[PDB]
mmCIF file of C-alpha atoms in Angstrom:
data_model
loop_
_atom_site.group_PDB
_atom_site.id
_atom_site.type_symbol
_atom_site.label_atom_id
_atom_site.label_comp_id
_atom_site.label_asym_id
_atom_site.label_seq_id
_atom_site.Cartn_x
_atom_site.Cartn_y
_atom_site.Cartn_z
ATOM 1 C CA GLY A 1365 -14.920 -35.503 -123.687
ATOM 2 C CA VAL A 1366 -13.183 -32.586 -121.997
ATOM 3 C CA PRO A 1367 -9.559 -33.011 -120.834
ATOM 4 C CA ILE A 1368 -10.238 -31.636 -117.353
ATOM 5 C CA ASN A 1369 -9.909 -34.934 -115.501
ATOM 6 C CA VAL A 1370 -9.453 -34.641 -111.746
ATOM 7 C CA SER A 1371 -9.072 -37.319 -109.066
ATOM 8 C CA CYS A 1372 -12.423 -37.846 -107.352
ATOM 9 C CA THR A 1373 -10.894 -37.747 -103.913
ATOM 10 C CA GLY A 1374 -11.177 -33.993 -103.644
ATOM 11 C CA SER A 1375 -14.532 -33.141 -105.227
ATOM 12 C CA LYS A 1376 -13.804 -29.471 -104.440
ATOM 13 C CA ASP A 1377 -10.460 -29.867 -106.219
ATOM 14 C CA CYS A 1378 -12.498 -30.914 -109.232
ATOM 15 C CA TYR A 1379 -15.064 -28.115 -108.885
ATOM 16 C CA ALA A 1380 -12.264 -25.547 -109.174
ATOM 17 C CA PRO A 1381 -11.118 -26.836 -112.666
ATOM 18 C CA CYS A 1382 -14.810 -27.106 -113.547
ATOM 19 C CA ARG A 1383 -15.719 -23.482 -112.850
ATOM 20 C CA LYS A 1384 -12.332 -22.249 -114.063
ATOM 21 C CA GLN A 1385 -12.707 -23.878 -117.473
ATOM 22 C CA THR A 1386 -16.340 -24.632 -118.256
ATOM 23 C CA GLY A 1387 -17.934 -22.056 -115.950
ATOM 24 C CA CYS A 1388 -20.800 -24.150 -114.624
ATOM 25 C CA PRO A 1389 -19.448 -26.698 -112.119
ATOM 26 C CA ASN A 1390 -21.125 -29.914 -113.251
ATOM 27 C CA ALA A 1391 -18.374 -32.346 -112.371
ATOM 28 C CA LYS A 1392 -18.852 -36.028 -113.002
ATOM 29 C CA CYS A 1393 -16.895 -37.035 -109.917
ATOM 30 C CA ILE A 1394 -16.627 -40.777 -110.421
ATOM 31 C CA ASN A 1395 -14.151 -42.719 -108.241
ATOM 32 C CA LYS A 1396 -12.016 -43.434 -111.311
ATOM 33 C CA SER A 1397 -12.176 -39.899 -112.736
ATOM 34 C CA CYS A 1398 -13.897 -36.560 -112.195
ATOM 35 C CA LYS A 1399 -14.907 -34.840 -115.424
ATOM 36 C CA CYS A 1400 -15.680 -31.107 -115.426
ATOM 37 C CA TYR A 1401 -18.635 -30.232 -117.630
ATOM 38 C CA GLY A 1402 -20.743 -27.118 -117.915
ATOM 39 C CA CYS A 1403 -24.456 -26.502 -118.127
#
């Protein structure tokens, strides 16, 4: 699990951490937690 957990209220606010860290913005934006993963 990657420690780039973002609140899934702002999906875009998750996508930024996603791209920034893991490059490919595959964010698991679940209500509880958005997890930024690459491809």
